[PDB]
Design an enzyme around this catalytic site. Structure first.
Site, PDB file in Angstrom:
ATOM      1  N   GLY A   7      46.232  11.827  43.892  1.00 19.48           N
ATOM      2  CA  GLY A   7      45.745  13.084  44.433  1.00 19.48           C
ATOM      3  C   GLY A   7      46.632  13.617  45.530  1.00 19.48           C
ATOM      4  N   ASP A   8      47.307  14.732  45.220  1.00 22.74           N
ATOM      5  CA  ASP A   8      48.078  15.516  46.203  1.00 22.74           C
ATOM      6  C   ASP A   8      47.034  16.265  46.998  1.00 22.74           C
ATOM      7  OD1 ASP A   8      49.445  17.570  47.502  1.00 22.74           O
ATOM      8  OD2 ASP A   8      50.821  17.896  45.811  1.00 22.74           O
TER       9      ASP A   8
ATOM     10  N   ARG B 153      25.271   5.575  29.010  1.00 24.88           N
ATOM     11  CA  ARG B 153      26.151   5.182  30.087  1.00 24.88           C
ATOM     12  C   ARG B 153      27.632   5.129  29.673  1.00 24.88           C
ATOM     13  NH1 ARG B 153      21.638   0.727  31.886  1.00 24.88           N
ATOM     14  NH2 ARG B 153      22.404  -0.034  29.881  1.00 24.88           N
TER      15      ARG B 153
ATOM     16  N   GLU C 123      43.076  27.675  33.454  1.00 22.74           N
ATOM     17  CA  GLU C 123      43.543  26.367  33.043  1.00 22.74           C
ATOM     18  C   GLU C 123      42.498  25.636  32.227  1.00 22.74           C
ATOM     19  OE1 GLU C 123      43.648  23.085  35.806  1.00 22.74           O
ATOM     20  OE2 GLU C 123      45.596  22.395  35.058  1.00 22.74           O
TER      21      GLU C 123
ATOM     22  N   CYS D 205      47.059  13.047  36.014  1.00 20.84           N
ATOM     23  CA  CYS D 205      46.508  12.671  37.305  1.00 20.84           C
ATOM     24  C   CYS D 205      45.019  12.392  37.199  1.00 20.84           C
ATOM     25  CB  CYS D 205      46.757  13.786  38.357  1.00 20.84           C
ATOM     26  SG  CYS D 205      48.530  13.824  38.732  1.00 20.84           S
TER      27      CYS D 205
ATOM     28  N   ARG E 129      43.802   9.284  39.512  1.00 25.74           N
ATOM     29  CA  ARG E 129      44.710   8.179  39.863  1.00 25.74           C
ATOM     30  C   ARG E 129      45.613   8.510  41.043  1.00 25.74           C
ATOM     31  NH1 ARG E 129      49.885   9.216  38.764  1.00 25.74           N
ATOM     32  NH2 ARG E 129      50.199  10.937  37.303  1.00 25.74           N
TER      33      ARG E 129
ATOM     34  N   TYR F 269      46.164  16.752  28.436  1.00 24.44           N
ATOM     35  CA  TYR F 269      44.716  16.948  28.333  1.00 24.44           C
ATOM     36  C   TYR F 269      44.252  17.662  27.078  1.00 24.44           C
ATOM     37  CZ  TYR F 269      45.038  15.741  33.261  1.00 24.44           C
ATOM     38  OH  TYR F 269      45.291  15.089  34.421  1.00 24.44           O
TER      39      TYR F 269
ATOM     40  N   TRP G  29      51.736  24.979  35.427  1.00 20.63           N
ATOM     41  CA  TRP G  29      52.356  23.972  34.571  1.00 20.63           C
ATOM     42  C   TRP G  29      53.778  24.324  34.163  1.00 20.63           C
ATOM     43  CZ3 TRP G  29      50.881  19.363  34.867  1.00 20.63           C
ATOM     44  CH2 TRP G  29      49.543  19.035  35.026  1.00 20.63           C
TER      45      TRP G  29
HETATM   46  N1  LIG Z   1      53.295  17.241  43.492  1.00 19.88           N
HETATM   47  C1  LIG Z   1      52.435  17.791  42.665  1.00 19.88           C
HETATM   48  N2  LIG Z   1      51.187  18.077  43.119  1.00 19.88           N
HETATM   49  C2  LIG Z   1      50.202  18.604  42.320  1.00 19.88           C
HETATM   50  O1  LIG Z   1      49.055  18.798  42.765  1.00 19.88           O
HETATM   51  C3  LIG Z   1      50.617  18.934  40.972  1.00 19.88           C
HETATM   52  C4  LIG Z   1      51.909  18.608  40.586  1.00 19.88           C
HETATM   53  N3  LIG Z   1      52.815  18.014  41.408  1.00 19.88           N
HETATM   54  N4  LIG Z   1      52.329  18.900  39.308  1.00 19.88           N
HETATM   55  C5  LIG Z   1      51.522  19.666  38.495  1.00 19.88           C
HETATM   56  C6  LIG Z   1      50.221  20.010  38.924  1.00 19.88           C
HETATM   57  C7  LIG Z   1      49.301  20.807  38.066  1.00 19.88           C
HETATM   58  N5  LIG Z   1      48.283  21.516  38.832  1.00 19.88           N
HETATM   59  C8  LIG Z   1      48.583  22.481  39.718  1.00 19.88           C
HETATM   60  C9  LIG Z   1      47.583  23.156  40.337  1.00 19.88           C
HETATM   61  C10 LIG Z   1      47.895  24.182  41.263  1.00 19.88           C
HETATM   62  C11 LIG Z   1      49.240  24.443  41.566  1.00 19.88           C
HETATM   63  C12 LIG Z   1      49.576  25.498  42.540  1.00 19.88           C
HETATM   64  O2  LIG Z   1      50.786  25.873  42.731  1.00 19.88           O
HETATM   65  N6  LIG Z   1      48.614  26.114  43.177  1.00 19.88           N
HETATM   66  C13 LIG Z   1      48.840  26.862  44.383  1.00 19.88           C
HETATM   67  C14 LIG Z   1      48.638  28.299  43.940  1.00 19.88           C
HETATM   68  C15 LIG Z   1      49.702  28.849  42.913  1.00 19.88           C
HETATM   69  C16 LIG Z   1      49.506  30.380  42.758  1.00 19.88           C
HETATM   70  O3  LIG Z   1      48.685  30.908  43.659  1.00 19.88           O
HETATM   71  O4  LIG Z   1      50.110  30.973  41.766  1.00 19.88           O
HETATM   72  C17 LIG Z   1      47.919  26.381  45.467  1.00 19.88           C
HETATM   73  O5  LIG Z   1      48.280  26.653  46.666  1.00 19.88           O
HETATM   74  O6  LIG Z   1      46.816  25.733  45.153  1.00 19.88           O
HETATM   75  C18 LIG Z   1      50.243  23.801  40.933  1.00 19.88           C
HETATM   76  C19 LIG Z   1      49.918  22.814  40.077  1.00 19.88           C
HETATM   77  N7  LIG Z   1      49.737  19.565  40.118  1.00 19.88           N
HETATM   78  O1  LIG Z   2      27.752  -4.778  34.473  1.00 23.48           O
HETATM   79  C1  LIG Z   2      28.323  -4.919  33.408  1.00 23.48           C
HETATM   80  N1  LIG Z   2      29.594  -5.525  33.337  1.00 23.48           N
HETATM   81  C2  LIG Z   2      30.208  -6.049  32.151  1.00 23.48           C
HETATM   82  N2  LIG Z   2      31.169  -6.857  32.343  1.00 23.48           N
HETATM   83  O2  LIG Z   2      31.675  -7.255  31.063  1.00 23.48           O
HETATM   84  C3  LIG Z   2      29.612  -5.631  30.862  1.00 23.48           C
HETATM   85  C4  LIG Z   2      28.662  -4.394  30.915  1.00 23.48           C
HETATM   86  N3  LIG Z   2      27.861  -4.501  32.178  1.00 23.48           N
HETATM   87  C5  LIG Z   2      26.412  -4.087  32.136  1.00 23.48           C
HETATM   88  C6  LIG Z   2      26.190  -2.591  32.385  1.00 23.48           C
HETATM   89  C7  LIG Z   2      24.939  -2.368  31.560  1.00 23.48           C
HETATM   90  O3  LIG Z   2      23.752  -2.908  32.217  1.00 23.48           O
HETATM   91  C8  LIG Z   2      25.205  -3.244  30.330  1.00 23.48           C
HETATM   92  C9  LIG Z   2      26.019  -2.552  29.256  1.00 23.48           C
HETATM   93  O4  LIG Z   2      25.141  -1.528  28.663  1.00 23.48           O
HETATM   94  P1  LIG Z   2      25.672  -0.021  28.435  1.00 23.48           P
HETATM   95  O5  LIG Z   2      26.084   0.559  29.784  1.00 23.48           O
HETATM   96  O6  LIG Z   2      24.398   0.633  27.893  1.00 23.48           O
HETATM   97  O7  LIG Z   2      26.819  -0.077  27.449  1.00 23.48           O
HETATM   98  O8  LIG Z   2      25.950  -4.364  30.817  1.00 23.48           O
HETATM   99  O1  LIG Z   3      46.945  15.995  42.538  1.00 20.36           O
HETATM  100  C1  LIG Z   3      47.346  16.096  41.393  1.00 20.36           C
HETATM  101  N1  LIG Z   3      46.547  16.683  40.390  1.00 20.36           N
HETATM  102  C2  LIG Z   3      47.012  17.163  39.121  1.00 20.36           C
HETATM  103  N2  LIG Z   3      46.232  17.964  38.519  1.00 20.36           N
HETATM  104  O2  LIG Z   3      46.838  18.317  37.269  1.00 20.36           O
HETATM  105  C3  LIG Z   3      48.359  16.715  38.702  1.00 20.36           C
HETATM  106  C4  LIG Z   3      48.946  15.492  39.474  1.00 20.36           C
HETATM  107  N3  LIG Z   3      48.559  15.648  40.915  1.00 20.36           N
HETATM  108  C5  LIG Z   3      49.564  15.252  41.966  1.00 20.36           C
HETATM  109  C6  LIG Z   3      49.511  13.767  42.343  1.00 20.36           C
HETATM  110  C7  LIG Z   3      50.961  13.536  42.714  1.00 20.36           C
HETATM  111  O3  LIG Z   3      51.287  14.111  44.016  1.00 20.36           O
HETATM  112  C8  LIG Z   3      51.699  14.371  41.661  1.00 20.36           C
HETATM  113  C9  LIG Z   3      51.931  13.636  40.356  1.00 20.36           C
HETATM  114  O4  LIG Z   3      52.948  12.606  40.632  1.00 20.36           O
HETATM  115  P1  LIG Z   3      52.737  11.086  40.133  1.00 20.36           P
HETATM  116  O5  LIG Z   3      51.457  10.542  40.758  1.00 20.36           O
HETATM  117  O6  LIG Z   3      53.989  10.433  40.725  1.00 20.36           O
HETATM  118  O7  LIG Z   3      52.688  11.098  38.620  1.00 20.36           O
HETATM  119  O8  LIG Z   3      50.852  15.495  41.407  1.00 20.36           O
END
Ligand SMILES: Nc1nc(=O)c2c([nH]1)NCC(CNc1ccc(C(=O)N[C@@H](CCC(=O)O)C(=O)O)cc1)=N2
Ligand SMILES: O=c1nc(NO)ccn1[C@H]1C[C@H](O)[C@@H](COP(=O)(O)O)O1
Ligand SMILES: O=c1nc(NO)ccn1[C@H]1C[C@H](O)[C@@H](COP(=O)(O)O)O1
Ligand SMILES: Nc1nc(=O)c2c([nH]1)NCC(CNc1ccc(C(=O)N[C@@H](CCC(=O)O)C(=O)O)cc1)=N2
Lengths: 287, 287
Positions: A191-192, A149, A61, A169, A189, A109, A83
Site C-alpha cells: 500500500g502506497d 465463509r 476503473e 497490489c 499486499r 484484475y 494504468w
Molecule cells: N508507486 C505506485 N503507487 C500506486 O499507488 C500505484 C502504482 N505505483 N502503480 C499503479 C497504480 C494503479 N492505481 C493508481 C491509482 C491512482 C493513480 C493516480 O495518479 N491518482 C492521482 C490522480 C491522477 C489524476 O488526477 O489524473 C492521485 O493523486 O490519487 C495512479 C495509479 N497505483
Molecule cells: O480455523 C480453521 N483453520 C483450519 N486450519 O486448517 C481449517 C479451517 N478452520 C475452521 C474455520 C471453520 O470453523 C471451519 C471450516 O469451515 P468453513 O469456513 O465453512 O469452510 O474450520
Molecule cells: O498502493 C497500491 N495500490 C494499487 N492499486 O492498483 C497498485 C499497487 N500499489 C502501490 C504499492 C507499491 O507502492 C506500488 C507497487 O509496487 P510493488 O509493491 O513493488 O509491486 O504501487
C-alpha cells in the site's frame, strides 16, 4: 469518531514508527508490515476528505475491471490515465514484453476476476466461457448462501504472475453477510499510503455498494488489511500537509436506479452527495 | 504485555460483541468479520499457554505440507489425526468424491504450495516438475531480494476449489524483511477460535522460524489476519474456562542443527523449551 481518522492515524504511525525500507522503484520508504482499518459503509461512503480523491478514476476503473479488461487504453480514453505508465511501450519492454501491444497490462484484475485459470494470450483475445468467473460466483453465493465463509475473489495467480506488468497490489478480497449487511475485506499486499491507498479504499467500498445493491443487502463494513504499508520518501512533506487538515463528514453514495446485474452498472447510475474535500495534494507515482 | 493477551482479547471481543451467525456445519457461531493480531517471534514462540496446544500435530502437519502431501493417511500414522475426518470415506462421498481414495483431501496446501497450476488427479499422482513451487520461490526471493513486496504463497486456487474437501482456511500468506528480520502475515478467511486458531498460529510461527533459519534472518513478527473470526456455540463454556487462566511466559523454539533447505527439516531438529501450559481443554470439531 470520524472513519477517516483511521487512515490519518496509520499515516502518523508510519511516520513515527515505521522503518526505513529500500524498494523496487529506488525511491525509498518508511514502512510498517501489517495494518488493519474498518470503514463503515452505513449511510456514508469513505471517500477521503483531507484531500480531493479522484472519484471519476475510481468509478471508471472499477467499471473497466467488471468488463474484464486488461487494456489500459480502454480506460485512458475516459480521461483516467492511472494504468497508462504500466502499459507503456517502454515499461513493457523493460519487463521483456516487447511483443506486447501498448496498453496490455497482462493477466491482471479484469482477467483474473472473470477468467481465472484461462490461458492468457493478449489483452484483446477472446476469453468467452474460459476460466472461472469469480465475480459472478461471489454474487451468486451471497444470494444463495450468505453465511458462506468462502466468498472470495482472488487476483493473485502464481502461474500468471510472470506475465503481469504489475502483480496485483490487491491480492484478494472476501465478502461476509450478517444481519442483512454485506461487508468486504481487502488483503492489500503493498500500500502506497499517499497515492494508491485512498483511491483503493474508495474502489472496494464502491464494489461493496454495487454488490449489496444487486443482492438486496445493505452495505456493512469495508475492512482494509495491509501487508507492506509504506510512505514513499517524497510523500512525507505532502502527507504532513494533509495531516494538518480537519476531516469533513464523509459523503453519501447514491445509486440512481435499480440495477439487476453487475454488468449493467454505468457511470451515470452513481452520485456522490455532500463531498467537500480539502484541495488536491499532488503525490508523484514511484515507477 | 504478554502476546497471548491478544488472542484472549479477541475471544472476549467475539463473546461480547460478536453477532450470532448460522454456519455450514449447522452448529451456529458468534462471529466478527475482520481482526488482526501481532505475535512477536523475537526470542520467544507463540505457543498458547492458557491451554495445552498439540505441538506434535503442528510440527508434523507442517512437515507434511512441505513434502507436498494431500494424503491425510500419511499424517495419520504419525498419531496426528487432524485431517482424517476431512478425508474419510463418508465425508468424501458426501461431497461427491466417491471415486476418490480415503485420505485424498484434494488439491489443498501441499499441492498448491509445491505445484500451483498443475492438473490435480489423485493424492498419489506424480506431479514432479509440474506447476509453481511457491514455497521454494518465496525462499529464493527472500535470499536475493528481501525488499520484495510480492513474497506470497497462495493456497486459494479458484480453479481447483471444487476438488478440495475443505477449501483452505489459510488463503494466503506474505513474507516481509526489514532490519534483518523476517515477518509473515497470514490471511485466514475463517477462524474457529477455539480449535483451529491456536494451532494455526503456532503453524505459521513455525514456518517463519524455518524460513528465517534457512535464509539467515531472525524471526520478526507473525501478523494474524482473520476474515470470519468465530466461536462455535459449543465452545463458549470451554473458552470461558480458558479466559480465567493467567498466561505463562511463551516458550522458546530451538532448531538443533544448521539446516540448509526447507526439505531437510525433520521432527528431531526442533525443541520447544520452557512450555508450561494450563491443561488441555477439549473443543469438539464442527463438521
Ligand atoms: N508507486 C505506485 N503507487 C500506486 O499507488 C500505484 C502504482 N505505483 N502503480 C499503479 C497504480 C494503479 N492505481 C493508481 C491509482 C491512482 C493513480 C493516480 O495518479 N491518482 C492521482 C490522480 C491522477 C489524476 O488526477 O489524473 C492521485 O493523486 O490519487 C495512479 C495509479 N497505483
Ligand atoms: O480455523 C480453521 N483453520 C483450519 N486450519 O486448517 C481449517 C479451517 N478452520 C475452521 C474455520 C471453520 O470453523 C471451519 C471450516 O469451515 P468453513 O469456513 O465453512 O469452510 O474450520
Ligand atoms: O498502493 C497500491 N495500490 C494499487 N492499486 O492498483 C497498485 C499497487 N500499489 C502501490 C504499492 C507499491 O507502492 C506500488 C507497487 O509496487 P510493488 O509493491 O513493488 O509491486 O504501487
Ligand atoms: N470446525 C473446524 N474447525 C477447525 O479448526 C478445523 C476444521 N473444522 N477442519 C479441519 C481442521 C484442520 N486442522 C485441525 C487442527 C487441529 C485439530 C484438533 O483436533 N486439535 C485438537 C487436538 C487433537 C489431538 O490432540 O489429537 C485441539 O484441541 O487443538 C483438528 C483440526 N481444522
Amino acid at each position: 469518531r470520524h472513519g477517516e481518522l483511521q487512515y490519518l492515524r496509520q499515516v502518523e504511525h508510519i511516520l513515527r514508527c515505521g522503518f526505513k525500507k529500500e524498494d523496487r522503484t529506488g525511491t525509498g520508504t518508511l514502512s510498517v508490515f501489517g495494518m488493519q482499518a474498518r470503514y463503515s459503509l452505513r449511510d456514508e461512503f469513505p471517500l477521503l476528505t483531507t484531500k480531493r480523491v479522484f472519484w471519476k478514476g475510481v468509478l471508471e476503473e472499477l467499471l473497466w475491471f467488471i468488463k474484464g479488461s486488461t487494456n489500459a487504453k480502454e480506460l485512458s480514453s475516459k480521461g483516467v490515465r492511472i494504468w497508462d505508465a504500466n502499459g507503456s511501450r517502454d515499461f513493457l519492454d523493460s519487463l521483456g514484453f516487447s511483443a506486447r501491444q501498448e496498453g496490455d497490462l497482462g493477466p491482471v484484475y479484469g482477467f483474473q476476476w472473470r477468467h481465472f485459470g484461462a490461458e492468457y494470450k493478449d489483452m484483446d483475445s477472446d476469453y468467452s466461457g474460459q476460466g472461472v468467473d469469480q465475480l459472478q460466483k461471489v454474487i451468486d453465493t451471497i444470494k444463495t448462501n450468505p453465511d458462506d465463509r468462502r466468498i472470495i475473489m482472488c487476483a493473485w495467480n502464481p502461474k500468471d504472475l510472470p506475465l503481469m506488468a504489475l502483480p496485483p497490489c490487491h491480492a484478494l478480497c472476501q465478502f461476509y453477510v450478517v444481519n442483512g449487511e454485506l461487508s468486504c475485506q481487502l488483503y492489500q499486499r503493498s500500500g502506497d499510503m499517499g497515492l494508491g491507498v485512498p483511491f483503493n479504499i474508495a474502489s472496494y467500498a464502491l464494489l461493496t455498494y454495487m454488490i449489496a445493491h444487486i443482492t438486496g443487502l445493505q452495505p456493512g463494513d469495508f475492512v482494509h488489511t495491509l501487508g507492506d504499508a509504506h510512505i514513499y520518501l517524497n510523500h512525507i512533506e505532502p502527507l504532513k500537509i494533509q495531516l494538518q487538515r480537519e476531516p469533513r463528514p464523509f459523503p453519501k453514495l447514491k445509486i440512481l436506479r435499480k440495477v439487476e446485474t453487475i454488468d449493467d452498472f454505468k457511470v451515470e447510475d452513481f452520485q456522490i452527495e455532500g463531498y467537500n474535500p480539502h484541495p488536491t495534494i499532488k503525490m508523484e507515482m514511484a515507477v
